[PDB]
């Protein structure tokens, strides 16, 4: 069971700086007099580390449920043994497995289960009246657990329950990691006489336990112990004391470290590779002593920022206007067939309008039509009354669907239909439109018939004259201005798209972003995905060329298609990070030199030199740089660059 706390005045968390802390043994091997570099998760030196308070003198009690990243660093400068243990988990609602690590007064146990955690687990310590000793009775950490897998009991560490307000005398560090489901604990007790701003001393953390649990951890909380003496009333609402305590919480991130080993295989010093140029020079040479001279550590490369695309101009508008704005429309049994090819497709005006009634596209989806390029585009056109519009779709059957116009079952086209009653019919009605009512058999898809013979229905021939049992398959349509909506004439245009072995001639519209120049950008001018700047050239191109190469056979000049400018292609920049060192036992600062990158800061002939001040006078030079300019450490005293004297 658990109880809830009451609101009070707390203290905001502050931030402190680490000083060579968070270094542990990365493996279970022995290395003697070895400078070995490994990739593992440590705490970076001189990094921002989150700080919490636990001292009463007020009423500071802040234990948030901090997120658990890949590896954490927990350092406590415990004196009166107020800290008890730690818990882990993801949701803390008896749904996932969760850790319970508590250093009790009798023994240390490691139980991982689904304990029902309250909003603030804590341990309660009372001061007995007859007994002058501090003892713990309120074991309010969780309610119950259902089932679990792993359990462990550590050594019976002796715990002191007495809290004071004096200065700290011991420092304890803890590192918790979870790789491949394996829990790692690193700890070491280090005495110190300090209260704040942890010293710059070095102390490697030895492994303690390797508990196999194999669950997920993303949240963790801290357990603190308070005291209930005779001064406080004894209620956990507004009056309590907690002694004096402090704990630090840090997060680990992966870095590359160079570790020094002595003759008995203990870590003495650590050098980073991504913190200081001097540290990079030390860790690249695999030595702790750097002499004077030039050194190459890494390289430098600029990255592209934007990605511009300029497709060529499009103006070949397809003849979609007159095929839709046609004064005369053919009959259903004599439907027109028009081929559209060798033009830039423009369906934008086709779907942005709303005068049409049907916009169903079978086979292909109309949401992507401008990005599809086809070889042949066909367009039929016929007029049908409003009832026989659903018969156009494949699969359905009817008079129009099987005797006048049949569509294949694998249609990948579109059907456009709209209503035009006033245009297609006058006050007296239209009678110039013919349709077929009878046929010998069914009609194959994409087949039209023109013959107007006499349909035979019976067995006895009628000798080719009008009579019984044989009639005219072709019949006329009647139209009225005041008829029903379903009897009004409707114009239907069917689009068919097919793919052949010929190159594609119908293509959709393309987009073109604005042209940015004199910057390291990426462009794709229909033949290459080149990244680089686009300067203004002074050489003209013949009016048939789009590309351009050089002596070394590299595409470095491409003409922009929409305004006909000739633009050059140049790689952005690249080089190496050279450093000059005064040497050992002489200085500590370095200066960064670039081989050919063009930009305290001095613009030398041999690249860009920063961190070295240029001086006009000339002495004898010792550290070569190039182009008649060297560097030296001369009078405080700093690194200078000058022309060498012969």
């Amino acid at each position, epitope marked *: 069971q658990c109880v809830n706390l009451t609101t009070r005045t707390q203290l905001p968390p502050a931030y402190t700086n680490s000083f060579t802390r968070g270094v542990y043994y990365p493996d279970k091997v022995f290395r003697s007099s070895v400078l070995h570099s490994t990739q593992d998760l440590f705490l970076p030196f001189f990094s921002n580390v989150t700080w919490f308070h636990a001292i009463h003198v007020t009423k500071r009690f802040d234990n948030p449920v901090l997120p658990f990243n890949d590896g954490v660093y927990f350092a406590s400068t415990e004196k009166s043994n107020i800290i008890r243990g730690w818990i882990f988990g993801t949701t803390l609602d008896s749904k996932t497995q969760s850790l319970l690590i508590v250093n009790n007064a009798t023994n240390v146990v490691i139980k991982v289960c689904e304990f029902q955690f309250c909003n603030d687990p804590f341990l309660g310590v009372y001061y007995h009246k007859n007994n002058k000793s501090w003892m713990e009775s309120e074991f309010r950490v969780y309610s119950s657990a259902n089932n679990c897998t792993f359990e462990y009991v550590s050594q019976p560490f002796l715990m002191d329950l007495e809290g004071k307000q004096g200065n700290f005398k011991n420092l304890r560090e803890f590192v918790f990691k979870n790789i491949d489901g394996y829990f790692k604990i690193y700890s070491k007790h280090t005495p110190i006489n300090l209260v704040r701003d942890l010293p710059q001393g070095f102390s490697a953390l030895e492994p303690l336990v390797d508990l196999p649990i194999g669950i997920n951890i993303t949240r963790f909380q801290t357990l603190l112990a308070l005291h209930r003496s005779y001064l406080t009333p004894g209620d956990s609402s507004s009056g309590w004391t907690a002694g004096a305590a402090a704990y630090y919480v840090g997060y680990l991130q992966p870095r590359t470290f160079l570790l020094k080993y002595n003759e008995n295989g203990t870590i003495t010093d650590a050098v980073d590779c991504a913190l200081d140029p001097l540290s990079e020079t030390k860790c690249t040479l695999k030595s702790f002593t750097v002499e004077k001279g030039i050194y190459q550590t890494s390289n430098f490369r600029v990255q592209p920022t934007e990605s511009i695309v300029r497709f060529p101009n499009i103006t070949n508008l397809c003849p979609f206007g007159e095929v839709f704005n046609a004064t005369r429309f053919a009959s259903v049994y004599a439907w027109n067939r028009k081929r559209i090819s060798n033009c830039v497709a423009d369906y934008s005006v086709l*779907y*942005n*309008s*709303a005068s049409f*009634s*049907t*916009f*169903k596209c079978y086979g292909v*989806s*109309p*949401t992507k039509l401008n990005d599809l390029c086809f070889t042949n585009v066909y367009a039929d056109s016929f007029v049908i009354r409003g009832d026989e*519009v*659903r018969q156009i*779709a494949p*699969g*359905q059957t009817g008079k129009i669907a099987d005797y006048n116009y049949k569509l294949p079952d694998d249609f990948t086209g579109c059907v456009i239909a709209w*209503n035009s009653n006033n245009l297609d019919s006058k006050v007296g009605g239209n009678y110039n439109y013919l349709y077929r009512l009878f046929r010998k058999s069914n009609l194959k898809p994409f087949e039209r018939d023109i013959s107007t013979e006499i349909y035979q229905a019976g067995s006895t021939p009628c000798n080719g004259v009008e009579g019984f049992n044989c009639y005219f398959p072709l019949q006329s349509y009647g139209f009225q201005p005041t008829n029903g909506v379903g009897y009004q004439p409707y114009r239907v245009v069917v689009l068919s798209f097919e793919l052949l072995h010929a190159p594609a001639t119908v293509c959709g519209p393309k987009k073109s972003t604005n042209l940015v120049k004199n910057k390291c950008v990426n462009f794709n001018f229909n033949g290459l995905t080149g990244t680089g700047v686009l300067t203004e050239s002074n050489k003209k191109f013949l009016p048939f060329q789009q590309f351009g190469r050089d002596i070394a056979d590299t595409t470095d000049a491409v003409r922009d298609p929409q305004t006909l400018e000739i633009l050059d292609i140049t790689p952005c920049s690249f080089g190496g990070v050279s450093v000059i060192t005064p040497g050992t036992n002489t200085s500590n600062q370095v200066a960064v030199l670039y081989q050919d990158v063009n930009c305290n800061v001095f613009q030398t002939r041999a690249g860009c030199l920063i961190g070295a001040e240029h001086v006009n006078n000339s002495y004898e030079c010792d550290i070569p740089i190039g182009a008649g300019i060297c560097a030296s450490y001369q009078t405080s005293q700093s690194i200078i660059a000058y022309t060498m004297s012969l």
Partner: antibody
Amino acid sequence: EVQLVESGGGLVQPGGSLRLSCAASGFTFSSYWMSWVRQAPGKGLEWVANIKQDGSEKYYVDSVKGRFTISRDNAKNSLYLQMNSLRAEDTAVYYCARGQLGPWVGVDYWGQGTLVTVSS
Amino acid sequence: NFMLTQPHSVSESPGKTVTISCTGSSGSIASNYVQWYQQRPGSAPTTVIYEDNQRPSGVPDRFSGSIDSSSNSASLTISGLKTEDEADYYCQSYDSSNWVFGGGTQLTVL
């Protein structure tokens, strides 16, 4: 990621005039169809009006025909809705609806909306 | 007078496949595209099914749609029936220059 902001309601008037505004960002306003959709509190969805990407063609429902108007502009990327001669049925939550290709693709865009009630 | 007919309380079921039918009377709904809209109660609506066969990006593949032209009805099928289904659904069509919306099918008990 497209932001739609509507702030045109919050007051009651019988038979007056009201001006609702929807603000849009993150896309090109002058190339897709636009619409306005309202729903009654506790009732189902119903369509109100639509407008082309250039404002040339506008349509409404027959219940609000005669009254109502819609206008747009592409310079400041905003949609304008104006109402007149309101009734008691007009208690509704109005969302500015954005299209992709036309009236067949789908609404698929419902701005959070603004609560609009009318009382005497 | 185009309108769409669909129920109001269906799919009150744990963890299996259930279909919801929306149908019209004035005309054939298979002529034009019909889409399904899915709305948080007390928040902005969204869309689960568009184009009548596809779904927007980020929508789980549990939802699916089909068209039956014999009964002139549109079917929406949900497979997972997980805990993220507390909504009312609508079917929307397009007859001629106007939009028509469905009544609404409340689904709360999952």
